[model samples]
Target: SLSNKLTLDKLDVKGKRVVMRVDFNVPMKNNQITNNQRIKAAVPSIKFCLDNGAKSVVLMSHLGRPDGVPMPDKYSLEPVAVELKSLLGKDVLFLKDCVGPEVEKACANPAAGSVILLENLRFHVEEEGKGKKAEPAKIEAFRASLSKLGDVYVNDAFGTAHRAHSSMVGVNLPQKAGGFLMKKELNYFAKALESPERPFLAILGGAKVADKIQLINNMLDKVNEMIIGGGMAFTFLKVLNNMEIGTSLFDEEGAKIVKDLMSKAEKNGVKITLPVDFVTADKFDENAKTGQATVASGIPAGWMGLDCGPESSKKYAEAVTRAKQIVWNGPVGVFEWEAFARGTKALMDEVVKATSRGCITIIGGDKVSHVSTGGGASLELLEGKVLPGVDALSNI
Candidate 1:
């Protein structure tokens, strides 16, 4: 399956216009962009096509949650075009619409090495598979409109790889391949999960245990050891004799799930560990008064847990150091708040340390994948989920 996927080098795009799908779903605040990491991530792929003798490049992406309504001003891709121009040090032609006459006119005439970014794909209901599936004619018409824009198609938007939207899957093109970023993300994720060195370790955290149940279940037999923490850890702690976690988040359903997971882990010969101590607070507020205590010693009546304590952080790091391959999905605690950031920060430091010591480490998730882009997409791929955006490409 891996060998059949086509990469950029395998395609011949000399002097041919390439239509590339990229993930530019950046954070925006009141019409102003807050982060340009997503835009920057697409630069290498966009540049590669231009440098490799492509006549021109057409980029498509979705932003925000328009939910099929054409809220042009609210979910516009215009801002992304400006940002791409600044990043590429060249002019990026912005088309107000992704299809129809205006877009066709723009693509029909292109300046060599120039870039063109389509407006939001979600503006059309067909892109999200709204009535397209039921109405085959409409779907085919929409797909044909997009296919005419370029001689080649490249899927590089890992963030949206899980969704089989029109630009991602419906568009039919002869010369199709995975972009540089898509190949890199897949290659690294495959190495971490497909087959790794001995003593493989997985560290999971986050707010909800329910969200990670599938991942936990999938990795149960794959890893040698599993470390649990973050707000989700309370669920596992609760499973261990109903410990008092105070006002901290605890999942009753998750508790039951972990109780069963623990049993399964024991049968599979996998070691599972939970935080021994936590940084607790009187309330859930970030500025709430705080203190440290052990999990064995029940938390006070009204105080809640925020982050793992120093001892727990040390223990987590020590466990990480012993592994040849480590995959961490979430922060061990509320790392967003200064008072509870230590444990998560410490774990990140240890991952870096392990990397220097010849250990392969991967941090997955939208928040944690800052170490690498496409955290959600990466985890989905690891779980062996099929990405329609990826599957749409031509095979080698």
Candidate 2:
């Protein structure tokens, strides 16, 4: 039923100017594109538009958080155009502005099969809408300006689909549909959530329980088994039992939430597993004095749990290997530092191994979503939220 929406194949884009929204929110270093996978992911949709006789493809996206205020060159999408140009093996026209007479002039007459990328959408404050009832008039004006840039609209940026922004949702367009990547994201998500294979497994971690509480509650009815790790696990480990977590990060409020969810999970026959052991450290820093792994039941007073222990990692792998479908949202530890990355790496490797065994593996969240881009966006989708970007599209 979810797939009943409009898709790229249903759109008649021949000889029409197609404005496509893609997720080019890639990592950059020193103004150099670090990973080009997001850009590459959008390629098929762009190529489809070209091959299907679309007059022109005007691409738009937002980069790093400019916070509604224009930043320096680092936040610019210029480097993205260069990276995409290399990937597409063609000249990607870079427009100085996203919506204006200049942008309209550039798209007025373009060679067939040509691609044009606009400047960062965040450069204009109107892109991210105001939350309050009274929105600035400029926001509506900007939306209208953007809507006029094309004959059809395609949303390929699954990463920003969760947010209600002008480029993705506010713009009024004659025809609209999901791009290739958006369709792929929705299809895979549907497989995992809509009617997943038996023995569904969900691995959740990260720093706080508040961020994933909705996801946890949502999956209680869907997953057969759930594994918890990272700093967030301490709260559950301590709440489920009167365990001594020592100096490990713990949220008293989250403990209550976990208590209620634990009960719900139990009632639904969902087995929620918390870390049994942890790799503890004398302090929180990378260079802190470290010790051999300790059981979660007896973390010393001065020590903090930084990662899942070897036993916990192995057990997590076992669960992953046994599952027919699995989704992991966070690392098992503070994986940024080499000292505490073993647990996270071990679990990730196991998920990859499961994928090879015909298991459906989906990874999301900022820390682990590199295995699959769209981090936050994917999580929102999994939580059963209607993405404004996808919902705004013209229905079939």
TM-score of each: 0.91, 0.92
lDDT of each prediction vs. the true structure? Answer: 0.82, 0.83
In Å, residue 206's CA in model 1 sits off its true spot by 1.7
Give every collision pair in model 1.
Answer: none
Measured by TM-score, how close is model 1 to the native structure? Answer: 0.91
lDDT of 1 by residue, 46-74 (tens): 88888888888999998877877678879
Counted clashes in each candidate structure: 0, 0
lDDT score for residue 78 of model 2: 92
The 10-residue segment of model 2 with minimum total lDDT is 364-373
160-268, model 2: which lDDT tens digit per residue?
Answer: 9888888988768867888888887788787788889869999988888877889889989799999988899888877766678889889877887887888889999
Which residue runs of candidate 2 sit more than 4 Å off their true CA positions? 1-4, 131-135, 366-371
Once fitted onto the true fold, the runs of candidate 1 whose alpha carbons sit more than 4 angstroms away are: 30-35, 131-135, 366-370
What is the TM-score (0 to 1) of candidate 2? 0.92
